[PDB]
Amino acid sequence: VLGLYYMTRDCVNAKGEGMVLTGPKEAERLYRSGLASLHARVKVRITEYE
Amino acid sequence: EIKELLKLGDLPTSGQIRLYDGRTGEQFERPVTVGYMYMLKLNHLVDDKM
Amino acid sequence: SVTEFLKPRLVDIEQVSSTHAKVTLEPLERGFGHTLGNALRRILLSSMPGCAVTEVEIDGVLHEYSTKEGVQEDILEILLNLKGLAVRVQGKDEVILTLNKSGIGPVTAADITHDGDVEIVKPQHVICHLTDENASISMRIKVQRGRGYVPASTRIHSEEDERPIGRLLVDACYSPVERIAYNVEAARVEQRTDLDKLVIEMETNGTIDPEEAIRRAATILAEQLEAFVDLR
Amino acid sequence: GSVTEFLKPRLVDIEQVSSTHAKVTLEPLERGFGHTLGNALRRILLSSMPGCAVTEVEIDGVLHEYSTKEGVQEDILEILLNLKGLAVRVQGKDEVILTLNKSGIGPVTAADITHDGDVEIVKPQHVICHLTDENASISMRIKVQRGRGYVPASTRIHSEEDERPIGRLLVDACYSPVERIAYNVEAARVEQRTDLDKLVIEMETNGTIDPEEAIRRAATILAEQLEAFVDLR
Amino acid sequence: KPLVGTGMERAVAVDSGVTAVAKRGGVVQYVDASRIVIKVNEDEMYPGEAGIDIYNLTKYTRSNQNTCINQMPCVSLGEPVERGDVLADGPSTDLGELAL
Amino acid sequence: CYRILGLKPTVIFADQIMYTGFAYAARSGASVGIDDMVIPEKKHEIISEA
Amino acid sequence: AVVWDILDEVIREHPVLLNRAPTLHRLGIQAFEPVLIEGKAIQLHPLVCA
User: Fold this and answer.
1) CB within 10 Å: which end of chain C, N or C, has fewer?
2) Rounded CA gap, C179 and C183, in Å?
3) What's its catalytic activity (chain D)?
4) What Cα–Cα distance (Å) separates residue C190 from each residue in C193, C194, C195, G27?
């Protein structure tokens, strides 16, 4: 629960804030590369199903 | 007094240091409380339980 | 022998697609799974050479937040689509492509002006959608060869005030790797429990296959080590 | 130019603060490769470095480690624990037998071990035991063999050497000569270029491995492991 | 020893008879893993006495809970010893301090 | 997830949730130190008023 | 060694019942496929602990 909560929290100013991401994979790449924080507010293209 | 004794030893006052994951070498995102604790072995050994 | 180690005897490849592959190696000495996996992951993420789109100029667009008629997507979404454009260039270090089209429907990668030194992986890839017969789109895109990923925020400088009107900046995804992940599981050889099994899940753009990407990353690391190796 | 042409590191400097502590500098390193090489080498060094350790001890008049010897300050178990820390460098064999004969009051240290020409004692001052009587004498026979990693005696009995005599004592073997490995990445302003990096690896060992040899062996292990990935289908 | 203690470790280790406590001061004349021989001070021995105290240490005996009871010397030859000093440490004792 | 997609996707989702939570809790380096127990500065005056 | 190979053959899809006392409700006994591990301690999935 703590890890998911820490993963899903936002910070007002964080590394990589304002970036526009092609998808979740690019977010993972940016995080593991250290270019963006988990809490960075970004616009991400998401495909969902209903 | 604990803070002052830490300061005499050139250690951080907060009692938390920057740790790195040995599996990846990456810094943990937050400082971690690292210190010394007195630990015991409590006679409830598994080889007496299995 | 104290200098003898376990080299993987079971190698398995599961191709989910032409771009997705799962490579499993076993057995590995205890802890070697994390070492090799993390080294390969870092090299693939941050150092793999490749070609990607970096700058875009659109005739009717002055800044990234400018609106243009006749295009369903905003300029930001067009920039994302251009980030998704997988292109490989032969010989040339930097190329400029031009895209002009008018017509109701999708404007895709197949409409980009062809160059003998440039190859597009997915012509079906959608760049934008044009909504009217009275609508035209004309853009110039810049493809360069580099390593890893350089965000546009790193390159926005006052030293680059030479940028004329509408020199939009695009994140450069040079590395072919779209996703690299590794997992370490247990393995045994004759009841020798403390052994590692390495699973590598790799997805890349259609520039190179995942196996080629792994081979190139390993080659890069081995070439880095060559000055310290004292054996064959 | 030459984006695909990475610069290759070399061992530019080796500094030895003490017989057990050293620093090795690798230069130049492209951006991001410093951390990769540092962590890989750290893991390999802490896991796989060969070394020599004490495996068996035979003391005259001692049947088991849970006993005492007249005139000796320490119990046999404490003597074995001290012998577990003996630093020995063996030059041309994977196993060697050392003799320790001492008499008279005083410390019994590593300098008192009868030495072969191909055996080096890194720390002669290392105290093995103490004799507290003039008529007290210690005669000891130690087996030092080369290995890798941590092999407890409980797992060592799996070797199934038939008919081990009563007076033979088994010591858990910690073959690893390295004790502490750290790495730092700094800016290497070399070749009139700014993005290159320098890797400083600081190692504390028991003094039984040449730091350059350890680094080269770690690199060799890593290269051999990578050979499977380079050649994969 | 516990780095962070409360100061009661000495009392618990000494009052419990697990440690060999010197009943008279003097200079330690002989030490080994099993025996401590103390030459008592001249101003502390009774008339017509050898002036020597012998402490025999408990070596590897079974506890009620099948644990090990072992006494180890914490003194060396020629060292001064006073009344009440801990001469040998017992199980879970380090220099006369409780070490659980 | 169970109500919409059924049993098998829910089991896979639960396992993935556990793995991700553990991994990112580890990466966070969350730690409890003595400084995290922040005492209000108003506490002393509230006690005095009481 | 052949005995160990046989044991690996026999436990492949043979569930075992794990029970913790007090068995207050029916979830106090649950079936799991056993993976053979070294050591003398049973390894339990974290999500079933509740």
Assistant:
1) C
2) 13
3) RNA(n) + a ribonucleoside 5'-triphosphate = RNA(n+1) + diphosphate
4) 8, 11, 11, 37
Ordered DSSP codes for D53-106: EEEEEEETT--SSS---TTBSS-HHHHHHHHHT--EEESS-SEEEEEEEEESSE
Give D129's strand partners. Answer: D108
Q: How far apart are CA D177 and CA D217, in angstroms?
A: 13
Could you tell me the fold of the domain covering C50-174? RNA Polymerase Alpha Subunit; Chain A, domain 2 (2.170.120)
Q: Chain G partners of F18 at a C-beta cutoff of 8 Å?
A: 46-47
Instruction: Report yes or no on chains D and C touching (3+ CB pairs under 8 A).
Output: yes
CA neighbours closer than 13 Å in the CB half-sphere of residue C129: 6
Please give the Cα distance from C173 to C51 (Å, whole number): 8
One-character DSSP codes across A27-49: HHHHHHHTSS-TT---EE-----
**Residue C6 is inside which H or E element, if any?**
none
Find, in chain G, the residue whose alpha carbon is nearest to that of C193.
G38
Tell me the DSSP string of D173-193. Answer: EE---EEEEEEEEEE---TT-
The residue with tokens 């858990």 is D172
Distance between CA atoms of residues A19 and A41, nearest Å: 8
Query: For residue B23, which residues of chain C lie inside 8 Å, CB to CB?
Result: 34, 38
Grouping H, G, I as helix, E, B as strand and the rest as coil, residue C103 is coil
Contact C137, C107 (CB under 8 A): yes
Calculate ∠ Cα C187-C193-C195, nearest 5°.
50
- One of 1.10.10.10, 2.60.120.590, 3.30.450.40, 3.30.1360.10 is the CATH number of C2-49+175-232, namely 3.30.1360.10
Task: Identify which of C230, C224, B22 has the alpha carbon closest to the alpha carbon of residue D212.
Answer: C230
CATH of residue E64's domain is 2.40.50.100
